[PDB]
């Protein structure tokens, strides 16, 4: 159940976009994960929920990572 979720989300370009945004904001290490623990931490920070938590409910896009910079645009 978790394997298919991980292979579907880790290859989602949305995941890469949110991951690079988090890397810019410094919420995740600038390098790609080298251990399963930090891969799970990156998934938690980028997706906003743990892989086990995602399989429980249905909402996915609500907890995706948001920038901490608060870039006043106008």
């Amino acid at each position: 159940d978790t394997k298919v979720l991980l292979t579907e989300i880790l290859l989602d370009p949305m995941y890469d976009y949110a991951a690079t945004v988090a890397r810019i904001d410094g919420s995740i290490p600038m390098h790609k994960p080298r251990t399963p623990k930090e891969a799970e931490y990156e998934f938690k920070t980028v997706i906003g929920r743990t892989p086990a938590e995602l399989l429980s409910q249905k909402e996915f896009y609500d907890k995706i990572y948001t920038s901490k910079y608060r870039p006043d645009f106008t």
Binding site: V4, L5, I9, L11, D12, P13, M14, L54, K58, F60
Partner: protein
């Protein structure tokens, strides 16, 4: 094309005769059209049991998927039975939208 060029009006021979009305009936006319057609943006499922999420083209390219959007159809079916007495019975059903 779906709403105008794909209207169905076909009469089929009745194949059952294990009832008085069954012997009375010799044909049923199937008649339906499509009323609502709409194509959505490509979607995908992650959990295999979860909500459908937007499928981006890069994911479809990597996974060998199809950048295809769901087609939703709504139809109205009119079934007409014929008997050997000149009368006909009409059962009119409306099909809700389905993919």
């Amino acid at each position: 094309i779906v709403k105008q060029m794909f209207n169905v009006d076909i009469t089929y021979k009745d194949q059952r005769d294990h009832t008085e009305i069954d012997k009375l009936r010799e044909s049923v006319q199937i008649q339906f059209n499509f009323t609502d057609v709409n194509i959505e943006r490509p979607q995908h499922r992650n959990y295999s049991q979860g909500n459908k999420i937007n499928l981006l083209p890069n994911k479809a390219r990597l996974c060998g998927l199809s950048y295809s959007g769901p087609v939703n159809l709504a139809a109205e079916v009119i079934l007409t039975a014929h008997y050997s007495n000149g009368r006909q019975e009409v059962k009119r059903a409306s099909i809700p939208p389905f993919q």
